Amino acid sequence: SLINTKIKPFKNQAFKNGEFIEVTEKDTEGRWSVFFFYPADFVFVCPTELGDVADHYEELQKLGVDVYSVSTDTHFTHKAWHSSSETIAKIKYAMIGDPTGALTRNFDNMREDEGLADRATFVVDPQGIIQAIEVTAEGIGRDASDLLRKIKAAQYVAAHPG
Amino acid sequence: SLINTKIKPFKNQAFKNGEFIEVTEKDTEGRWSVFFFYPADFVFVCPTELGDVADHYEELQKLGVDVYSVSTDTHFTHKAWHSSSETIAKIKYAMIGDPTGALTRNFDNMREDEGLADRATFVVDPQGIIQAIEVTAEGIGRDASDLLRKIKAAQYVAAHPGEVC
Amino acid sequence: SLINTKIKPFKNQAFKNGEFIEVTEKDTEGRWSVFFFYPADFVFVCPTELGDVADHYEELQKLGVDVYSVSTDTHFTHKAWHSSSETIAKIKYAMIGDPTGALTRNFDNMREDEGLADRATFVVDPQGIIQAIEVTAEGIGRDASDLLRKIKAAQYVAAHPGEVC
Amino acid sequence: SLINTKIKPFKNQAFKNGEFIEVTEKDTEGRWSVFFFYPADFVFVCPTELGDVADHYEELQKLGVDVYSVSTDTHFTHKAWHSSSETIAKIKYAMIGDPTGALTRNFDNMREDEGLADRATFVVDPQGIIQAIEVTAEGIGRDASDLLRKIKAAQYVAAHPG
Amino acid sequence: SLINTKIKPFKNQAFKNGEFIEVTEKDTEGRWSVFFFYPADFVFVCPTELGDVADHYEELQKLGVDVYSVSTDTHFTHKAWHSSSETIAKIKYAMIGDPTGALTRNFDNMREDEGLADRATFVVDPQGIIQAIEVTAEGIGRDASDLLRKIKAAQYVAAHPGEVC
Amino acid sequence: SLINTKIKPFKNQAFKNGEFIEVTEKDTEGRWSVFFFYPADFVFVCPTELGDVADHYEELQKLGVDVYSVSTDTHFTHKAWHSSSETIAKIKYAMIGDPTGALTRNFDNMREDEGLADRATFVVDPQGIIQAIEVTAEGIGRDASDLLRKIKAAQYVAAHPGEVC
Amino acid sequence: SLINTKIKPFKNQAFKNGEFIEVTEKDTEGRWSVFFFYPADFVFVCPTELGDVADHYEELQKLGVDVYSVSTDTHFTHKAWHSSSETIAKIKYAMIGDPTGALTRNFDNMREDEGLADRATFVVDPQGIIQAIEVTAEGIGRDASDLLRKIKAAQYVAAHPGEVC
Amino acid sequence: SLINTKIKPFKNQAFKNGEFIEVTEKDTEGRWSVFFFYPADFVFVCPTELGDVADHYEELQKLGVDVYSVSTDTHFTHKAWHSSSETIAKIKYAMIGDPTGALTRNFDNMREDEGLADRATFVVDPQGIIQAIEVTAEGIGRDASDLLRKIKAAQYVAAHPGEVC
Amino acid sequence: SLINTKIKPFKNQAFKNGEFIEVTEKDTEGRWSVFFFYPADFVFVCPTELGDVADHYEELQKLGVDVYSVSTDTHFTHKAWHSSSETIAKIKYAMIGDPTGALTRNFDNMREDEGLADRATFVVDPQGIIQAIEVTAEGIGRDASDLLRKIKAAQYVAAHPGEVC
Amino acid sequence: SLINTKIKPFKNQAFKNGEFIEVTEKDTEGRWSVFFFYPADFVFVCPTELGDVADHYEELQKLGVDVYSVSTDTHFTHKAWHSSSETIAKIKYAMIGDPTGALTRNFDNMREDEGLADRATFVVDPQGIIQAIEVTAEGIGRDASDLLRKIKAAQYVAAHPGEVC
Numbered sequence A, D: 001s002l003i004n005t006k007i008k009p010f011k012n013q014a015f016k017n018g019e020f021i022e023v024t025e026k027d028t029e030g031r032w033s034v035f036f037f038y039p040a041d042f043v044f045v046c047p048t049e050l051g052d053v054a055d056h057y058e059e060l061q062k063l064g065v066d067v068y069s070v071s072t073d074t075h076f077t078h079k080a081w082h083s084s085s086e087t088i089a090k091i092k093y094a095m096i097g098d099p100t101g102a103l104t105r106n107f108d109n110m111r112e113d114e115g116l117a118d119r120a121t122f123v124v125d126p127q128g129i130i131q132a133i134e135v136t137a138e139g140i141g142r143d144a145s146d147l148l149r150k151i152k153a154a155q156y157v158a159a160h161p162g
Numbered sequence B, C, E, F, G, H, I, J: 001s002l003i004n005t006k007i008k009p010f011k012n013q014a015f016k017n018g019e020f021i022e023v024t025e026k027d028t029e030g031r032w033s034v035f036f037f038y039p040a041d042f043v044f045v046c047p048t049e050l051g052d053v054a055d056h057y058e059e060l061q062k063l064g065v066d067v068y069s070v071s072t073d074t075h076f077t078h079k080a081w082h083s084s085s086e087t088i089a090k091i092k093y094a095m096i097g098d099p100t101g102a103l104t105r106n107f108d109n110m111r112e113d114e115g116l117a118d119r120a121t122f123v124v125d126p127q128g129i130i131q132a133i134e135v136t137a138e139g140i141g142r143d144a145s146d147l148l149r150k151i152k153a154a155q156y157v158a159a160h161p162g163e164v165c
């Protein structure tokens, strides 16, 4: 896996609380980042995983972690979904659009026969090193609280080596 | 260009009148087809071009011409756009989703830097042969009337070999 | 397609209003150009497409648009055709001869098994960027009016960055 | 990642409750399997991750899941460790030795510059399809209870499609 | 040179005495053939070399010799030239169009930077073997009389082995 | 074999008298070295061979000969084995761990199917040159006495060039 | 063919008027040259082609034209033939020996399965440019009178550029 | 090393007790073999190693072990050396000549810059599997007694599967 | 060298005793052959080597030995030389012409920068095996008497295998 | 053959008149050299060819000619043979050992399936140019007298250019 490797450079468009912005690897430097990948916008399962992360976001602006959700849809589509789904509307973190699939492939997380990303979460430290990885098949949800545990543990070790 | 070449096999999901269907090159054999590519769903420009084709769909269907719009968005996104936009809600033809980019690349129509299809229209005859191509840069609009005129000329020469418009 | 790519360097001989001249990509720099390809001179179909463009040349010249028709025939043949055909005689724009096929291959527009160019039109802006492409099979005519519309829209977008027609 | 792919064939030696046995891909066919990788035997952190999994093993023989722990040490070393560490002594599941690194590389989980496996866990269904993946850097422990959650969810979806 | 090699298969369209026909290597089998290449139709030099061969065509047909003139122009252009040049109008042998240049390249006779054939003449016997070759720069005419002489000498040798003429 | 070749650079962790150290080829330069490879720690055979070398370590050290045992096990495992086995507890020389297999492959001594090193001993002189090699199949024991005799002969010829034992 | 290309550098021995000399491309610079290839010396056919060229040598020299006959025989053999044959004895131009075949291959004129040159004549202008080529099979003689005509036409065109009738 | 690999096919000439014979891998099948390589015949060091092995040959023959000494010298040289050296005269086992170096390279035992074999001994079981390898630099003698010990241990393990000495 | 190898197949023309004949490897089968190469015919050095071989031809024929002299000249040239030179006129063995150099290259005997064969003699036995080779630079003559000696020794060994003194 | 090529660099050990020496191409510079190859030392045939050269060594040294015999045996073996064969004992010139076969391969004289050199003699002038080559099968002796003759003729030509001996 990509555990303990450095994230690669990227430049993508995103939707965040009503505005369109640019996100690059430079925006992660000096912060803790969570890259939350999912298959697609607008499907019919309510996105509890995205919503669950939203519930913990305040607590996530925190201990110092930025959250970037990612799918191969465009930022345009994320904006639409943010206005259509009451669950998605709760999202205050950046929703990255990855139509070329470069971000997804950077994290080796593309389902090539579908053009969609797999359900994978990555925790990246201020130096751009992936410290935790979680991937699940459709139907097996990711628990945000548990994500938080890992992140706290990740932070301790980093300030208390060993 | 791809003029006078045969379309390649494909298999995609599409949104057509409230449902999700599967389209393959098999559905196009024996029929006249229009592959109408566009960059993306939900952009802030009014999808005038797509609605314009909708306006002529009845006459196209009367002439045995199927229409397929294509974007690298998913069919899920097409369903939503169809239920959010007044213009897009007028569409009764299949709205193909091409998230792998395969269909778009079959027609050599990908803006590889952006992961979106260029604004191109292809007219395919019952034998799978491309008989008319139109591509334009962003901001330059496609006139459905011109497309319709071309289709009629194409169908005419097919019926009257060695005779031109 | 070649949409939004830069045209390539080329050097060809041409016939323009009684004279033989040389044309290169350098003559297109800073201007709007229309490259109008067609199969061959002297066939038996009235060359309505070329004459139709000639009818609009005056107006195109007002918009600062140059027109170059292109076939794999020589400039000598274009001169001869310009004196035998009353329709071709109307042409005041450059008729480029492309016997080596290099211009045609630059625009990836050659029918290799025939040694003739496909019926393709390309609109090129002052920076050498292709902004509109139109290709059709034999029998399916190109409407010059639709070409003008496209050129005007192209000029608008270029002078009003961040707008669509 | 390897999410939703089929595990590869393998043949390894292992230690399980006092006996040496052989494990092959054939031993996983028709069962749910958990492949628990770790860096090395005998280091000085008490292996709470391995012990935590042991605590849930009974409950793990279960709902029908076999547990295979894996490191690039030999089975001989696992036997020794099982007699030296009171925590390791609690282990009743198979301890696979992977000295050639083929199992570890099958799961693309080798730290090539060290010759040790990364801390990764994989959940494999009866048909050999990886349904859940978890990887963490040193210092960030894996919670066994949480592993169990994923496995149960994995099992539901598989018997209740969608 | 190609002396004593066998001509290669070819398929070209041609203009011959008012009609468009097809010519292939199969049409040369069992006959004496003259392949007469020239740069282009409609240039401003009198086509006297071609006219000179035309003057001798009667006599060549008596000797059982077929004549094929070849240029990289189309057969459509040969027809036009045949109606425009009083000299070309004398031509009753086949005027082959070679727009793809394959026939010209078969005889290794293409000026690649121009897309035109060099002024080369080849004499081919009933078995498809090249028995005489003549190539000249512009201005150095090819004499049909000398051509006839060579063909008669070639025909003699073929009916009287081990003797030179 | 690797006889008369120079050892390659390396960097490994080892267990030596209660502590963890790092060994590189730098530690061997200027000294006589014995690289004693074995398949694995904790097997049920009494590591008679390793203890046998321990028995001669004092005399080896007196002769300026360092010893390094090597296995693809980690140095953590060596520490444990050293504290579990009476025989292994007698060892005062470095016990190198080679989990990447790099050191073992430098000496072309890997059983690639098993990931364990073959039973081989290498004698390296102060210049890094291999002067004696011994390899045996499982069950065939290595005699430390023979190794000691060889080292003495090796040191002798180094001191008395052009003279043999 | 080699038409309109520059001759390549060469250095050969030759027999000329009772003497052995060296000939190189530098001896052709600034002059009109005729390279006359033939299969072999001493065959039993009267060497009428060489003698015919000999008859016109005086006159060619007046026009400033040098003649070099070439075969893959040595210059030694040319001397002998020049003393044995009454027809060859009239030759006053240089007889080049080409045993390595490098001159012959420069002119692409070797019958590889025989090691002999084909019956080819090349006319080279003062700048080393091949202006006329003639090749024939055995039995089909080369007419010196026709050669002379071509050379005069070549000289004319060169001094009166595009002054065609 | 070559430990636990199968020996390769070979065919060499040899001297054995007054006779010249041929030796191949087929002669080793079903027997225990010792391949004893050394640099060269006739050097000035007493060939103690070879004589030492000869002293143990009787006993080795009892254990069903064949001995083949090998150098890149010819069998002729071995015969000569066997008659000049009182030590070599003791040899009753086959002295293989390997002038082409193929046997030596089979055991990857050639000093390529010298054309001589390194001092290596290999013990091969009835199935052609190398069970012990010993290689030393010049000056470091091989002890035949240690060789015997190894062979006996090798025979034990082979007859008592799952044991170690 | 080619020593102890089999001659290769060849087919050449030759002059022999007033006649032109064909020679192939089949004409050498069952006989002893001498292939005598030399640079060229007609040089001004007295061809003493060929004449020396001629003097011994009778005697070589008694021993059942055929002689083939070879140069890259044609057989036509050999006939001429045989009629002009008193030394060459004594030659009754076959004079092979090798214009393509294939015979000469078969014997690896070509001076590539000259197109001539080196002064080499090869002795070939009834089975086509080269048994003696002699090559010399210009000025260093080949002695026919020494050749004869070698041929007799070759015949002896062939009929009395390893009967050496 | 290698006739008229320059010998290549080499470095070999040799036995010469009781001492071991080194020989390199540098030792041949400025001198006449004879490289005399033979298969092997100690065979059962009398070494008369070598003895014959030995008989002529005095005279060859007067002519400034050095003699190097060469076989793929070692110099150690040459020393032994020189003490064993009364014929070899007459040798006072250098006996080169070529165990790696590089000197033999330099002269393209190796029988690769045997690892022995063919019976070849080469005569090398002061500039390192091979002027005479002689190769024979077993049983066909090389005559030292004929060798001397060739060397004298070679020395003559070298001091009297443009004259053959």
Ligand SMILES: [Cl-]
Pocket (backbone or CB within 6 Å): A001, A002, A003, A107, A108, A133, D001
């Ligand atoms: Cl990963």
Ligand SMILES: [Cl-]
Pocket (backbone or CB within 6 Å): B001, B002, B003, B107, B108, B133, C001
């Ligand atoms: Cl296209």
Ligand SMILES: [Cl-]
Pocket (backbone or CB within 6 Å): B001, C001, C002, C003, C107, C108, C133
């Ligand atoms: Cl295009």
Ligand SMILES: [Cl-]
Pocket (backbone or CB within 6 Å): A001, D001, D002, D003, D107, D108, D133
């Ligand atoms: Cl993975």
Ligand SMILES: [Cl-]
Pocket (backbone or CB within 6 Å): E001, E002, E003, E107, E108, E133, G001
């Ligand atoms: Cl040609």
Ligand SMILES: [Cl-]
Pocket (backbone or CB within 6 Å): F001, F002, F003, F107, F108, F133, H001
């Ligand atoms: Cl080794």
Ligand SMILES: [Cl-]
Pocket (backbone or CB within 6 Å): E001, G001, G002, G003, G107, G108, G133
């Ligand atoms: Cl040519």
Ligand SMILES: [Cl-]
Pocket (backbone or CB within 6 Å): F001, H001, H002, H003, H107, H108, H133
């Ligand atoms: Cl080895």
Ligand SMILES: [Cl-]
Pocket (backbone or CB within 6 Å): I001, I002, I003, I107, I108, I133, J001
């Ligand atoms: Cl040879």
Ligand SMILES: [Cl-]
Pocket (backbone or CB within 6 Å): I001, J001, J002, J003, J107, J108, J133
């Ligand atoms: Cl040679």
Ligand SMILES: [K+]
Pocket (backbone or CB within 6 Å): A072, A073, A074, A099, B072, B073, B074, B099
């Ligand atoms: K997409």
Ligand SMILES: [K+]
Pocket (backbone or CB within 6 Å): C072, C073, C074, C098, C099, E072, E073, E074, E099, E115
């Ligand atoms: K053309």
Ligand SMILES: [K+]
Pocket (backbone or CB within 6 Å): D072, D073, D074, D099, F072, F073, F074, F099
């Ligand atoms: K290990």
Ligand SMILES: [K+]
Pocket (backbone or CB within 6 Å): H072, H073, H074, H098, H099, J072, J073, J074, J099, J115
């Ligand atoms: K040897």
Ligand SMILES: [K+]
Pocket (backbone or CB within 6 Å): G072, G073, G074, G099, I072, I073, I074, I099
């Ligand atoms: K020749």
